Design a binder for this molecule. Structure first.
Ligand code: CLR
Ligand code: HSM
Lengths: 231, 275, 340, 128, 55
């Protein structure tokens, strides 16, 4: 029965070769970070059904996945992103007196925060298009007052850091939106995830990458500190 | 006074029981489950194994010698006993040092961590630790590199200073620097969580880092500093320059660290507690 | 104009309900209470296949009951031998996200698909010795959730744009498209004779289609939420469905309604996989509470528990000769279970 | 079969009051969160209000706060909305919506592309 | 709107006129099938260890 011995030898040889190749691929898999980009086409240049982008900062590799080929029912594919490092959230703000877009952005964020399979994923928030707020606040009609009636009883926080050359109304509106987003996330989490907000303008060739890098560094540093009972 | 004998027997028995129980619990917990088998938990397993071996194969003879006050088993067995004690203690201390360095690399360079700790390096580290231990114990006692009834380790000037400055002091200094840096970063992060929401409460901010690092760097010092200081003094000035009661006390303080190692390095980790 | 059509639809629905009620003479739980219960079905783990890096998401058996194929979320499709644990093939994919795989009854081709809206067909003969990509089928406008083989030259696919399609592989064209659902379509099962198939969607409904002609014939609805799995009874006269309301159900085709519902008060989690045994007596279901349950299909009582996984259980399979059961979960492990 | 129906509607003068009722059939009513959605002439769908399983978590949108009220009755399986002091910018078609899965804290139910679990709505007009 | 309503009406009309059979006959058929093939279910009547390919 030499045929049986020959078959066993051939199978063992193929197994060893395949296992060697997989062992070589494991390192490349574990030395990369996945990110999901979600909106509610210009930003992707700053850094088909699905679009994949790859970049590298400080000898570290970053994936990015844009999902624009799907429909608006999200409850079934959003589940296949439960092992990513961060979720990049892009919102559009305005202050000109047809549809309330801030409300749907807030509701979608609230749904993502409390989902069962995404209870351990952090969110990086980009409050895009701050120029439109400045353009529409000079009109004298406050859309923010029309939709949100609690804006009148609002005072700017003590730790404000306004840019030189900005009307106080624009800054107060921006901090109002930021506080609205933080009030949702500071009521559910037990310490397993956080939220990182930022402002931009309707130009991040060398700006988005650095901020994403720093935020990911913070996320993993806290993840490791919390395991040893130091935070 | 038989009451003293009863008290000493009770305390030695309870100490040995605690040591063996803790080590075997850690080993069984690691072995049974599969979620706790990973590359950063090999060091804890090595620590548990060495502590269990010391607690099961060295301590009872020391207890018998202490109570009876006469060695009655020959002369070769005494040499084997001394060599085994030295090797196990040195290995335990060096494993603690390795855990310290690993935590520093994990906290300080978090994006490049998985390309800086690989099984090859872990194996190299463990092999070097055990080679240094076996050398310094066995190849030194038998060849008579430390020589100048009773069964106690012999010390001269050169061996005393070399062992002291290679096994304890340099690791102590390096560990102090490392945990100082980690503590700075921990408080820096903790200052920033409590200033994002100006309408609610905060974390503890003082009982988290200060307590956990103080425990770790206090157990080590209290348990091991006096023994090595007495070691060096005894080597440099003579054997008739020390008292017996102090020597026994420092020896047993040294032995007692193996009872606290599992509690500190396996009950504060969240992965072990969860699984 | 719309109101008249709505009233006509309501009248037709009332007609259907009355006709269905006219035939409910008895129930399955009255004339099936004179049969001995099976007992306790205790199974043991015989093998364990390791080597994946991320969550296994789909699995399918082969016709010889020896070789199997597994799809992982890291971009790997692996072909395993079960008796000896050896690996036979490993194939890397272009797009990491994969949601389905199949294995042709002839043994020569493999199929793959996912979030890229494309179905890839791979060849395994490979006289030159290299597993290469043989065909790429494109034309859906949503992610692809299931695919089954009819022969070496036809294929059936389900997409999340509320459509099903049939393809010929040599040309790369859509022969027929089945439309009429209202939400995403999740699973599909082929009949033993390959002339009909069922579809289950995210609107709490199931539909039966005829392949040759191309229209719907029956629509079944008894559920409260989305349907995630479906499978025929061995003789092609009934099927079973699992959903997200912690309840499985059994439907029959000649009577056009439901016969029995499996649920318990301790279960408040959804179902991700269903399958029958060889004789149609046991029913195996996979849950989100990390273990599988074995029910008795004719008594609606639990008979056994398979608890060996440490995360969500995703895929479940039963061989053709009924000698083993395979389970795959998000902990990146496959397990083969057998009795004794 | 999941089925939802709406009743109450018509034309009212500014500053008036009105009531909307929603009846359900085909599911266990008391395990699901439920909410009220609204569509205006020439615009997209927007979310008005929502209420939870027991009645201990009620949330409104900004524009209708202080004028509209939500309630639910689990014995008779019904959902109520009370409209007070209307303005001309409220003329629309109103829909009753249900969240997809039981025992959850999240919803994905404003989608235009024929979301399954909501009814046909009622018409509300305000004018002279 | 009109096209979808007409399609739904036509589909319901087509689904209205089919033959049907009583439930008890379906139950009896399933009972007969599950009783005929009882001796070829290794997951129900386990086989000895001398014929198990997995042990
Ligand atoms: C916290 C614990 C582990 C500290 C150690 C306590 C025990 C082990 C130590 C502390 C005091 C020590 C004793 C101090 C005095 C003497 C008298 C001497 O003629 C024999 C040794 C003997 C009897 C020592 C035995 C060990 C001893 C009892
Ligand atoms: N029991 C500790 C003896 C020793 C170890 N190293 C030096 N001396």
């Amino acid at each position: 029965t030499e045929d049986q011995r020959n078959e066993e030898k051939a199978q063992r040889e193929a197994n060893k070769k395949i296992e060697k190749q997989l062992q070589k691929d494991k390192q490349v898999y574990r030395a990369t970070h996945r990110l999901l980009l979600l909106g509610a086409s210009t930003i992707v240049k700053q850094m088909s059904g699905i679009f994949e982008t790859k970049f590298q900062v400080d000898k570290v590799n970053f994936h990015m996945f844009d999902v624009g080929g799907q429909r608006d029912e999200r409850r079934k594919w959003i589940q296949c992103f439960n092992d990513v490092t961060a979720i990049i959230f892009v919102v559009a703000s305005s202050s000109y007196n047809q549809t309330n877009r801030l409300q749907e952005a807030l509701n979608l964020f609230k749904s993502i925060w409390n989902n069962r399979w995404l209870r351990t994923i952090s969110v990086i928030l980009f409050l895009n298009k701050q120029d439109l707020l400045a353009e529409k606040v000079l009109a004298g009609k406050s859309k923010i007052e029309d939709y949100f009636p609690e804006f009148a009883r609002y005072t700017t926080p003590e730790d404000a850091t306004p840019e030189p050359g900005e009307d106080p109304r624009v800054t107060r509106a921006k901090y109002f939106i930021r506080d609205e987003f933080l009030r949702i996330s500071t009521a559910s989490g037990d310490g397993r995830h956080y939220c990182y907000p930022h402002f931009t303008c309707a130009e991040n060739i060398r700006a988005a990458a650095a901020r994403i890098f720093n935020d990911c560094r913070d996320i993993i540093q806290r993840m490791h500190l919390r395991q040893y009972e130091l935070l | 006074s038989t009451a003293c004998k009863i008290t000493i027997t009770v305390v030695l028995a309870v100490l040995i029981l605690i040591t063996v129980a803790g080590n075997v619990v850690v080993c069984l917990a690691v072995g049974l489950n599969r979620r706790l088998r990973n590359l950063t938990n090999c060091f804890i397993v090595s620590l548990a194994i060495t502590d269990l071996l010391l607690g099961l194969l060295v301590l009872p003879f020391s207890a018998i010698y202490q109570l009876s006050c006469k060695w009655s088993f020959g002369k070769v067995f005494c040499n084997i006993y001394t060599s085994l004690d030295v090797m196990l203690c040195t290995a335990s201390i060096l494993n603690l040092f390795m855990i310290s360095l690993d935590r520093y690399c994990a906290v300080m360079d978090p994006l490049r961590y998985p390309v800086l700790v690989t099984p090859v390096r872990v194996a190299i580290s463990l092999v070097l630790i055990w080679v240094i231990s076996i050398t310094l114990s066995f190849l030194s006692i038998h060849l008579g590199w430390n020589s100048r009834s009773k069964c106690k380790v012999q010390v001269n000037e050169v061996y005393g200073l070399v062992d002291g400055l290679v096994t304890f002091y340099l690791p102590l200094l390096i560990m102090c620097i490392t945990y100082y840096r980690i503590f700075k970063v921990a408080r820096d992060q903790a200052k920033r969580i409590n200033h994002i929401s100006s309408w609610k409460a905060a974390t503890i901010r003082e009982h988290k880092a200060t307590v956990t690092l103080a425990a770790v760097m206090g157990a080590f010092i209290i348990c091991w500093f006096p023994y090595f200081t007495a070691f060096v003094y005894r080597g440099l000035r003579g054997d008739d320059a020390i008292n017996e009661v102090l020597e026994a006390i420092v020896l047993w303080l040294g032995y007692a660290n193996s009872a606290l190692n599992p509690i500190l390095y396996a009950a504060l980790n969240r992965d072990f507690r969860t699984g | 104009e719309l109101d008249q059509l709505r009233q006509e639809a309501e009248q037709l629905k009332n007609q259907i309900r009355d006709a269905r009620k006219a035939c409910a003479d008895a129930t399955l739980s009255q004339i099936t209470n004179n049969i001995d219960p099976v007992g306790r079905i205790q199974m043991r783990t015989r093998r364990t296949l390791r080597g994946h890096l991320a969550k296994i998401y789909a699995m399918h058996w082969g016709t010889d009951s020896r070789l199997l194929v597994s799809a992982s979320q890291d971009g790997k499709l692996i072909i395993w031998d079960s008796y000896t644990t050896n690996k036979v093939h490993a194939i890397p994919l272009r797009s990491s996200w994969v949601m389905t795989c199949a294995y042709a009854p002839s043994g020569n081709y493999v199929a793959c698909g996912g979030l890229d809206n494309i179905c890839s067909i791979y060849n395994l003969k490979t006289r030159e010795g290299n597993v290469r990509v043989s065909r790429e089928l494109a034309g859906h406008t949503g992610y692809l959730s299931c695919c089954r083989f009819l022969d070496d030259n036809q294929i059936v696919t389900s997409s999340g744009d509320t459509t099903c399609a049939l393809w010929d592989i040599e040309t790369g064209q859509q022969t027929t498209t089945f439309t009429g659902h209202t939400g995403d379509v999740m699973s599909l099962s082929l009949a033993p004779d390959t002339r009909l198939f069922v579809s289950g969607a995210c609107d709490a409904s199931a539909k039966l289609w005829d392949v040759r002609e191309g229209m719907c014939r029956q629509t079944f609805t008894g559920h409260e939420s989305d349907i995630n799995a479906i499978c025929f009874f061995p003789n092609g006269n009934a099927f079973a469905t699992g959903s997200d309301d912690a309840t499985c159900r059994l439907f029959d085709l000649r009577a056009d309604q439901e016969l029995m519902t499996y649920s318990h008060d301790n279960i408040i989690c959804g179902i991700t996989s269903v399958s029958f045994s060889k004789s149609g007596r046991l029913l195996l279901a996979g849950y989100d509470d990390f273990n599988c349950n074995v029910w008795d299909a004719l008594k609606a009582d639990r008979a056994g528990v398979l608890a060996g996984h440490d995360n969500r259980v995703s895929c479940l399979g039963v061989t053709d000769d009924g000698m083993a059961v395979a389970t795959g979960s998000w902990d990146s492990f496959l397990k083969i279970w057998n009795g004794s | 079969q999941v089925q939802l129906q709406e009743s109450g509607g018509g034309l009212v003068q500014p500053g008036g009051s009105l009531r909307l009722s929603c009846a359900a059939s085909g599911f266990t009513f008391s395990n699901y969160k439920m909410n009220w959605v609204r569509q205006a002439p020439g615009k997209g769908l927007e979310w008005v209000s929502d209420i939870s399983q027991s009645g201990a978590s009620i949330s409104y949108t900004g524009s209708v706060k202080g004028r509209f009220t939500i309630s639910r009755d689990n014995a008779k399986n019904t959902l109520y909305l009370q409209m007070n002091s209307l303005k001309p910018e409220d003329t629309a078609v109103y829909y009753c919506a249900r969240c997809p899965a039981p025992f959850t804290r999240d919803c994905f139910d404003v989608t235009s592309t024929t979301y399954a679990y909501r009814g046909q709505g009622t018409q509300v007009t305000v004018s002279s | 709107s009109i096209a979808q309503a007409r399609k739904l009406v036509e589909q319901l009309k087509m689904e209205a006129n089919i033959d049907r059979i009583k439930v008890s006959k379906a139950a009896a058929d399933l009972m007969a099938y599950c009783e005929a093939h009882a001796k070829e279910d290794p997951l129900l009547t386990p086989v000895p260890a001398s014929e198990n390919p997995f042990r």
